[PDB]
Scaffold this active site. Structure first.
Site, PDB file in Angstrom:
ATOM      1  CG  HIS E  49      -2.215  -0.927   0.805  1.00 41.95           C
ATOM      2  ND1 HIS E  49      -3.121  -0.642  -0.191  1.00 41.95           N
ATOM      3  CD2 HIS E  49      -2.572  -2.134   1.307  1.00 41.95           C
ATOM      4  CE1 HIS E  49      -4.006  -1.621  -0.272  1.00 41.95           C
ATOM      5  NE2 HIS E  49      -3.699  -2.535   0.632  1.00 41.95           N
ATOM      6  NE  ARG E  74       0.925  -5.270   3.257  1.00 46.35           N
ATOM      7  CZ  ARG E  74      -0.135  -4.739   3.865  1.00 46.35           C
ATOM      8  NH1 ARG E  74      -1.048  -5.530   4.457  1.00 46.35           N
ATOM      9  NH2 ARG E  74      -0.282  -3.415   3.874  1.00 46.35           N
ATOM     10  CG  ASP E  88      16.282 -14.693  -5.318  1.00 49.92           C
ATOM     11  OD1 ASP E  88      16.377 -15.724  -4.622  1.00 49.92           O
ATOM     12  OD2 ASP E  88      16.110 -14.750  -6.556  1.00 49.92           O
ATOM     13  CD  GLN E 151      -2.096  -8.771   5.121  1.00 46.15           C
ATOM     14  OE1 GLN E 151      -1.222  -8.356   4.393  1.00 46.15           O
ATOM     15  NE2 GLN E 151      -3.094  -7.995   5.570  1.00 46.15           N
ATOM     16  CD  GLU E 153      -5.644  -8.713   3.638  1.00 47.52           C
ATOM     17  OE1 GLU E 153      -5.642  -7.698   4.358  1.00 47.52           O
ATOM     18  OE2 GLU E 153      -4.861  -8.875   2.662  1.00 47.52           O
ATOM     19  CB  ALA E 178      -8.405  -1.759   6.379  1.00 45.73           C
ATOM     20  CG  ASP E 179      -8.047  -5.323   2.356  1.00 48.04           C
ATOM     21  OD1 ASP E 179      -8.613  -4.816   1.370  1.00 48.04           O
ATOM     22  OD2 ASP E 179      -6.836  -5.250   2.513  1.00 48.04           O
TER      23      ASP E 179
END
Ligand SMILES: [Mg+2]
Ligand SMILES: [Mg+2]
Ligand SMILES: [Mg+2]
Ligand SMILES: [Mg+2]
Ligand SMILES: [Mg+2]
Ligand SMILES: [Mg+2]
Lengths: 256, 256, 256, 256, 256, 256
Positions: E49, E74, E88, E151, E153, E178-179
């Site tokens: 985000h 993330r 990597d 997650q 969500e 939130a999601d």
């Protein structure tokens, strides 16, 4: 995190210890981290002869930070403002080029010290140098952890070596053989017996004065010789040169 | 400047010629230019296993451009949009990872070709690929100068090798020994006789089909062996590995 | 690669050929490459009046390198350390602003030369200037391939023009109409008869000393005029001005 | 600061006003600001055919923010995560390439809307889209201020035009004539004599369904025509093309 | 350096210790380092985000590396190639968004494992993950030191929560309010009794399966509550929100 | 766009209005935009004690441009070329450090003015200062819109305060209490009991000479005091300090 500054490179220097270094000349944080995995005692981040901005220097310090190898920063020149920039970002060990006189050497020291003694402007206390306030009483701790190394690399500088060596706040004197060779009347040829004699006596004089003596030797034979003479912060290669040579050596195995 | 596209790497490949390469894994344009001064026939800019953004790739192409070494770009994967990005910036030679099926191989080719034949979206004509319009009739010239190399690096891919080799638009097949070794039931050990046998027969099959055969061999002995087997685009080292090894070798001269 | 230095801009200048140039003012390697595809004789990478860092300069050099247009670098000021940085990245032709006296001009020459001929510190051997040692005997070849252009762009500068033209190592004198006009008491009015007069006489005097005469004219009328007066390194445009005008002109087709 | 979202582009689109645009193809924030000073109605920041990272897109939005010209972002493709990225940085008008079917068009619309109505990932209050919470009730306000433009530029997309036009949440339909001509079997010359009709009919059909109609026409003659036909979001140039042409034109005055 | 992999975050998580964390949302290495001096247990480097490129992620890792706070990465989505890139560069702890099914969860585990255990392509040996070969037997050590957090969500995710908790290789399940709230038909109202209820039950169920339970609560009240409910990797703040609030609060002292 | 220069900071200064400010110390454009949303009266972009390049300064101006908060730039030092650089990028309010004498103050003023009145180098029509020529008659307009603030923060500067205050072209005089206390022999604690008087008298003397008086006070108690005394451009925080404190405060709730 710790509230005390420490400079392991300075600690080792004070103990007379031999420290083996490498020049970092690519400007890149990516290669600086890779080089730090080698375990050199110090890494010279060259802001003088490679095109590093103050941000490149910052990023290279962040790259090497969690590794054992200690960074040493060389700015474009030892002016008040350029010294100011590198000290505020938390470069604790500086190599200053073209120090030719005791007066220049005193001015360099003054640039690194806060009022009473020097002319350093306040502001590190909220910058990387004091870790944004996590280093308590930064102004009180700082001098003991700052390590100042100056380059003597002209005929004038050698003439002034005794005066320079007596300057309070100078921790080490570094001899750059190619500039010195040029200045002595032998450009492109540090291998001349006059130059070698000057290098050897200069190293011995620096150690005899109780200061650290430095050198860059890209030929391992010369590095071994300067170590024998008593140099105790010795850079033994330039990363870009080691890189190019390795590339050429690998390719040569496949080309006739 | 010239209105004709040329791809010297492709020209040499078509002539059967052996081309010696090096992986570039630092993401940095600074080191890419330095590596280009070595004179490798090709340089693999690794967008797959090094953290290159599309801009890093662009900068590395600009770095190597005036040198003889030909760049080859490997994207993160051979998807339509990622292929689109690298072709528009003027990467004329692609190495595509993880091509396991003839259908995947046809889709990769379709991604590189404009309508009628493929699905490439128009827009290079005003980008680096057509040099902002200086390349006339870019859409007409382009296919002849695009060179497409696909990696066969799983057991599935070897099973499908004949089908893949028959796919129109594929110029070469590359074998990555460590992925292939893992997939064949021998992780971390390409040195097993089964793996070596598979590598040798696979190389010979690729050449027998009239296609170029590729390999990455970080051990020079293995590189010589793959050349003997008929591999003709062979990468013989990874720049970061050559760098680290050179750094370790220099330091070792000074540490006990 | 080639082990020899050459400077095509300088060879042409020595032959007295007219070289048509363009200011690059965006700082961007992306636009520098696009500009290079036009085939101007020279491109002025402006580190004085656009916010270029030493890295931006480096990337612009890398961008234009494969193309025929020859780069010229103007640093923010002609100081010893700023000249050092641009030489080390391999800028072979420099435009130095605000050269007001024969003394300043000598100092600039000295900043570009290694001992015994000047003050330049070594380190180009491990940098782009010598292509990391691929240019053999750099120290021996270098002076021949360096082209120095100085700006005479103040009243003080005009008074000293003959003394400046007699300084060994200066290849060309460039008249800057914006700064000169202002210095003369006609700021923003270079078209004034009194200024046009002094520009004309200054150009003829430069050429009479056997040196090249330079100018920037953003008005084509003025450019042709200064060429008629004898100027032979003449920049005829600023790329950002050409961009803006072109965008305005296209928009105006749909707004009227 | 202002707590209300607004989208002047979308408001004018809804009024059926004609909006004149320019492609931004250099990826650079420096040129985006310069271009914004022209006062085009809109500026298309091309993240599909120019090598923009999400950071380059961010910086061009920041550059143009204080000017009257309204930014439109085209991402590399209209995938869920790539639309998520560009929405979160506060791009309020999107141009989505390669929308070939009504199902695709629905999927794009859903990617722009939060659950439970769509599948946009929720996190805009920790991003520029909600100006870090200075936009109050962003989730309430957001649909009304987002403007969605899709590209119908292939044979399949054309076959599906009516159905695509029936999809709720699409504000405009853009036709790219070079892509469509290629798809219809006319590689370059752009819009050939044969497809002008196919183009005109589409423009009229689009406006007939109550949607805005878009076009890129780099030829002013063609741009007037598409406007005559009903196109109301028309890009009339590509900034790098306008640049190159202007550079060529200025130079030709001296190679004349 | 150390030849062993370790993951302090994972060891703590396995012991069931509570780990307090902070979202990093600026993309900047400069702020990441500053944040690391606070000594949060973990720092969430948000590539979903905030507009982080793979390079921004890399630089943030380099910045926090010397400090005790452990980084978690993330990516923009949990795809095979995006997971490949972050592994990597040496991210040892991943937070994967929008894991909705046991199948997606298995695919994520497979993306993190080398053959035979999964699909991960080799190349970490020549990258930061293995510290360029300084980590010996990387392939053998790696699975033990990788920590995977997924997650849950969405409504789909909740329905599949038991199936997801039974997937081998998942270390922790993170609830995204939130999601999830939006998915449930309460967008921007996570405080709703119905949502708070489902959060509580979800946390207890996660812990009951012997897995760690995660959460982000920007309200301290909610954070303490979720801790009381059994959440043991709990992010308690977003750094950009803390910045904004702190700046507002200082300003308000002089505006009232 | 608007063809008129304006400087709302300078206009409010001239009205004697109190203007509340914040130091921007992270060098990042990302944080500068976030900070601008707070609506401080001014934001000091610190190019002296934070490692900003001229490009970082450019990008922070671009970030804050559309917001109400007015930017003030402090360069590394007030040299002619560094002031030239920051003026050309369109910084209309400068804060100059270490102005110790009236001769220095005059030299700074001259560096901000074009010839023949000063020594500013002429080239703003090819830069952001004149918005690439969209500001008509920039050279005519510029003096009225430029705001010059100097720092008097040493013992020598204090001794010279009246004389400095007599220099025409200085709009305000800033006192940095930590620098001054150090210079007066009080390293840290900032403004000690001993120098409060010395500070107050100076603030009153500054306002008495018809100039604005400035201060940085990171303690709100001290900031109220300096305002009570007559200070009218007062920075009341350093953004990185406010950040760190807020991070510590949120964390302490869970280590409680
Ligand atoms: Mg030297
Ligand atoms: Mg592979
Ligand atoms: Mg000038
Ligand atoms: Mg198209
Ligand atoms: Mg979420
Ligand atoms: Mg101060």
């Amino acid at each position: 995190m710790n509230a005390l500054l420490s400079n392991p490179f300075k600690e080792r220097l004070r103990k007379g210890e031999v420290q083996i270094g490498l020049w970092l000349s690519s400007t890149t944080a990516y290669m600086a981290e890779i080089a730090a995995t080698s375990g050199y005692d110090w890494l010279l981040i060259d802001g003088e002869h490679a095109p590093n901005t103050i941000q490149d220097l910052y990023h290279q310090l962040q790259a090497v930070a969690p590794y054992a190898s200690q960074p040493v920063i060389r700015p474009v020149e030892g002016s008040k403002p350029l010294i100011k920039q590198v000290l505020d970002i938390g470069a604790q060990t500086l190599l200053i080029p073209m120090v030719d006189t005791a007066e220049q050497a005193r001015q360099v020291v003054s640039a690194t010290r806060y009022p009473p003694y020097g002319e350093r402007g306040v502001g590190a206390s909220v910058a990387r140098a004091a870790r944004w306030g996590r280093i308590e009483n930064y102004m009180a701790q700082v001098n003991d952890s700052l390590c100042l190394l100056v380059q003597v690399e002209s005929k004038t500088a050698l003439d002034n070596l005794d005066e320079i060596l007596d300057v309070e706040g100078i921790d080490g004197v570094f001899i750059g053989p190619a500039d010195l060779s040029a200045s002595l009347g032998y450009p492109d040829n540090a291998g001349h017996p006059e130059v070698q004699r000057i290098i050897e006596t200069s190293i011995r004089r620096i150690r005899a004065a109780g200061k650290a003596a430095g050198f860059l030797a890209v030929a391992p034979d010369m590095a071994q010789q300067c170590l024998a003479w008593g140099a105790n912060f010795v850079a033994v290669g330039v990363d870009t040169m080691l890189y190019s040579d390795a590339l050429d050596q690998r390719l040569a195995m496949f080309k006739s």
